[PDB]
Amino acid sequence: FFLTTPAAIDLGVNIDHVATLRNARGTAYPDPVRAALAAEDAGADAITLHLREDRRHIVDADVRTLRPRVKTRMNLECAVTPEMLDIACEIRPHDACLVPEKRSELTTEGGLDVVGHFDAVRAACKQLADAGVRVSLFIDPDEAQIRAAHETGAPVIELHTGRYADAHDAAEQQREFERIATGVDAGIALGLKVNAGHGLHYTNVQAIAALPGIAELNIGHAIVAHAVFVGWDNAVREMKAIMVAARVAALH
Amino acid sequence: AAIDLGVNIDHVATLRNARGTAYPDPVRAALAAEDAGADAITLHLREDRRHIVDADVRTLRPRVKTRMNLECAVTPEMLDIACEIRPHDACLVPEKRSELTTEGGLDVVGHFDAVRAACKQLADAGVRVSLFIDPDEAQIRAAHETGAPVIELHTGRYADAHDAAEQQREFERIATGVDAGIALGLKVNAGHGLHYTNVQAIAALPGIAELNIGHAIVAHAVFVGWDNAVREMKAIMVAARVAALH
Amino acid sequence: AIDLGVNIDHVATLRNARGTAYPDPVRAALAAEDAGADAITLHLREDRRHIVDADVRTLRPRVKTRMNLECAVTPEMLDIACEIRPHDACLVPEKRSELTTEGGLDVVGHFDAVRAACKQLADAGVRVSLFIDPDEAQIRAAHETGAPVIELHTGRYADAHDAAEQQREFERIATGVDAGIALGLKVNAGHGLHYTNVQAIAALPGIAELNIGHAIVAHAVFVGWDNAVREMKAIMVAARVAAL
Amino acid sequence: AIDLGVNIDHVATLRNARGTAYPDPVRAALAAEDAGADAITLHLREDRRHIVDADVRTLRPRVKTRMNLECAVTPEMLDIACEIRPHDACLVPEKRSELTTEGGLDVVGHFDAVRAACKQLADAGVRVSLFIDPDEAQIRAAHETGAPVIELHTGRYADAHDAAEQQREFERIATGVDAGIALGLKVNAGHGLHYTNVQAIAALPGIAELNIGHAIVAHAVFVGWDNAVREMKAIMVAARVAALH
Ligand SMILES: CC(=O)[C@@H](O)[C@H](O)COP(=O)(O)O
Ligand SMILES: CC(=O)[C@@H](O)[C@H](O)COP(=O)(O)O
Prior knowledge:
transferase (chain D), 48% helix, homotetramer, EC 2.6.99.2 (chain D), globular, 15% strand
């Protein structure tokens, strides 16, 4: 027996692709800012948005307008460059996730190469922390990178669920799932909080939300994709409900 | 499908009957529920025709793309209508106070012969029969003795529970009642009073074949739209079931 | 501009059929306002068949727009209305002795009662409306009561069995609107209106507000409440603006 | 009484962002028909920026209403349009050398090319619309090409920065319609129209069909696709019918 309760597993909603849609036409709509606040009303525990150097989807006005309006938590994804880090320390989001943008900054799987850029990342982690931001590193589920993330001082890691999501068949999906599971264990063993989310959708998130060690799933595209047919409030509420049901039933 | 959802459409008819027009149309509701993931449509032709009326059942029966579950009382008029229509499934429910226990399930012990004969009459018309009963040892045992292959447990007290403690105690009656029915070779269903925050623990029980759910879906549908309400409930149950199996 | 009043009564109907708190008429009202409703309407019946007293009391201080309280001409219900101080009250017939055969309030027949109820609600700062048939004599009686608003019974128009009958019943409403506006009355409508018969009524310039209930709930079950309300509002505004 | 063409380009825009099959432009198309759309519109661009050949090829046999294919006046795409045999085609500018400063197809300037294209498509049984500005010189030339339909560029109306500018531009669209009907053309519109500016355009009795794209997808994100389509149609019908009576 158990009580269902929303605190069991947090959902971060990524609003980037609402921006993709708005930028397509050039008007202010559909508004990413309204998207974020409506997601909070629908049960999102944080709002996630990636301010790219090249400002391809989310733009600066989106971040600056939304920051003071946020009811829950802002999770600002950004690159490890001095100028973006300055923006992050000025805006003071509750959380930040350091993500690679330039190819020299990522691995072949797609996570931050914390190993190869160790000093720069440890410094970023320090200044963000000095400005009161809880820092996460978006990394591959590779034990060396996880260990390296822990050495940087970052309290959080976000594991890259892309290969899990894009698995070609069930045998390959299970293998990638095991990489994630053992990534979570190694991260927890070092006292890191561990998140996930990349590529997760309405039929592959359950197996991930059933992992007791995961704190928060940060989900973007799939929610927007489901919203077009179903409506934003419902797409959010539904993904949250599925996550919570998987989490709780797997615990007891 | 890891677990089946039957969507009950009675309270769509409640809305319709309040106005006297054909809208909102229960028949549309039922076919759309199937399109959004329902494995069966449940409907209760009461003797007093309070919500669902005969024409709703007759129109729906040849259209249904999954399974029809007809709820009805144990009386000749209704049983004969059921045998004429030949739904895939029927669930015998009480409509008179003399037919129900205080908990509100069918009093199979007190009306054993009438119920056992009903079971025979429907089984002859090719209908899979279920008895709507309390999670009560005596009633479960009696149900097995009627020859009906299915029971649906009355999850009302569980659903209506006020505290964590009271709901825990009622949950274990249901869990116990599932184990008992399975041990006698019955399929066990549930669903009365189940909604979007109490369905998960019941779906987590692997012995439950199908949850037949009504008012919670229609109530949520008002705000969220019917396709979404059904889909979401199905998603939550499957997530609960499969996560608990592994 | 044309106003939509959303009647939440049949949300309460769905709730009372199971005995839980859901669907919550209070939440339905507050979300109708978010979706564009200009007022919320609810009929506290003497027999509390759908909406109940706790519904009206809980919602009243939360209203961001206007509350239109439908109730009968009896002292208890008038006492409750004067205590709640809704923005609007619409006096409706409940007893068979208060009904015309068409179904509106017999204001001619209960003039003194209705006038006193008007004075009583007006003293409590409530803008009073009388639900009536599109009948010139009732419209006149309505005006003599001192009520500033009338709501015309569009149910015959709504339930017309064919186009000829529907057009004649439309002409009656149109004439009623002219008659009521010629006396200084605000005129409302809405009984039985839905998504393919509201347009013609919305197109009449003299209509201030359409108070619509069951059609929005029936649509919302498939479409969602927010959508159903916003859509009715948009259709109404489309019709009105194009008509001018 | 008035038709709604639902343009599905920006559903694909959303799909290509991620590189999976979702959200599926084909599903959107079919669900729009169920919601009341009279036609499905898609622009197969020469660079394939949103809609791709698979979308158009897979959607075509499944279309229950009619397909309106937007494509450019060049052999490759015209040859494709003839393969697909959509019910309607709308010729539109894609290169800087084919469009006016306002953004319409420079029909007067590419007359021989457009006339040939109208011939080729009509001989494949496709009914041809030309996307043009509401300028008399271009409407007259459109008629000269043999094309039975024109679609007026409502973008300047839609982008108007004040009430006065919006009246001026509205008058251009209105007189553009008169001028087109006078030559026996069917006249459409659609570019830039949304849920608070479509009404004045829908009130014009001469307008056959509104082809609307981005406003619906943008609304759909919050309210759901079926609802955004149905609601656009109902506002169009409401405004049209009330304008007639
Ligand atoms: C489908 C719909 O939109 C409903 O509103 C319905 O078709 C009419 O409602 P009535 O029940 O009021 O006739
Ligand atoms: C305001 C709204 O909800 C959108 O539906 C609107 O369509 C915006 O349209 P634009 O794409 O024209 O800004």
